[PDB]
């Protein structure tokens, strides 16, 4: 079963309609099928072109009075801001009056690559004391990045499989690379130190994690869900193995990014 779970994480998509704030204020759109596990800037040289003609005269994106961050993965952004919203996704395009106060300057392509490898490294740190990624010659890092950028699933996982192995003697990873985003995008994410297995050898379940680090998402009466707990657009069962979750439904940056919605 597992390999298909991985393929269907990798290829999850978001239908998206870019329209211009100045066409809306004055609405011909650009339709695209955004990869859920990529980042805006990575696939917005194209958008820059399409509307570059009309750019007679520094481009950012927005959604219902909310700038969209260049370094959160697309899928997480959708899940967190607009899961219940009707499709296709309506992203406003603004190339004037950049929100420096409420937005990071648009990263280059290399600056994103920086963030991506930096996240992969912060992940292998918590997973294997950095012993796995460090070993890798620079070319392997580049293979990871180019496999993401070019949607080459096979290429990318050829290298990532090593990063999802763990010692025989252990029942999983050291800690789990995870981030939890709550009410809004401007709300900080949550990251903590959690072990895949407890003292008694029991494998930890997502339910255990949310009970520990985020109990406000647990009905204190029946121990079941109080809010929506979304990952890659679905809601797994609170009794799902966190070790397995990390191995199979992390974003390519090896994190379990987890949206929480009331």
């Amino acid at each position: 079963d597992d390999k298909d779970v991985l393929r269907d994480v990798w290829f999850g998509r978001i239908p998206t309609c870019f329209t211009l704030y100045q066409d809306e204020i004055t609405a011909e759109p650009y339709y695209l099928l955004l990869p859920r596990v990529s980042y805006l800037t990575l696939v917005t040289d194209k958008v820059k072109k399409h509307f570059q003609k009309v750019m007679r005269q520094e481009i950012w994106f927005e959604y219902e009075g909310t700038p969209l961050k260049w370094h959160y993965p697309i899928g997480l952004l959708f899940d967190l801001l607009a899961s219940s919203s009707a499709l296709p996704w309506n992203i406003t395009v603004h190339f004037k009056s950049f929100p420096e106060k409420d937005l990071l300057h648009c990263p280059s392509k290399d600056a994103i690559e920086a963030h991506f490898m930096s996240c992969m490294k912060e992940a292998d740190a918590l997973k294997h004391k950095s012993q796995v990624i460090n070993e890798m010659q620079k070319k392997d890092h580049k293979q990871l990045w180019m496999g993401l950028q070019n949607d080459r699933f096979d290429q990318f996982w050829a290298i990532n499989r090593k990063l999802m192995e763990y010692p025989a003697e252990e029942n999983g990873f050291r800690y789990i690379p995870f981030r939890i985003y709550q009410t809004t995008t401007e709300r900080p994410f949550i990251q903590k130190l959690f072990r895949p297995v407890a003292a008694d050898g029991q494998l930890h379940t997502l339910g255990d994690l949310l009970k520990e680090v985020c109990p406000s998402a647990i009905d204190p009466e029946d121990g079941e869900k109080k809010n929506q707990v979304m990952i890659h657009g679905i809601e797994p069962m609170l009794e799902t193995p966190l070790q397995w979750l990390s191995e199979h439904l992390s974003y390519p940056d090896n994190f379990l990014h987890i949206s929480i919605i009331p």
């Binding site: 779970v5 998509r13 978001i14 499709l87 296709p88 657009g233 679905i234 797994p236 069962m237």
Partner: peptide
């Protein structure tokens, strides 16, 4: 849980990709 994850992903794919 595994079957729920796989199937839910199946269905997720179908709504969002199928239609459009």
């Amino acid at each position: 849980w595994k079957r729920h994850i796989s199937e839910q992903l199946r269905l997720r794919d179908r709504l969002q990709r199928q239609a459009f």
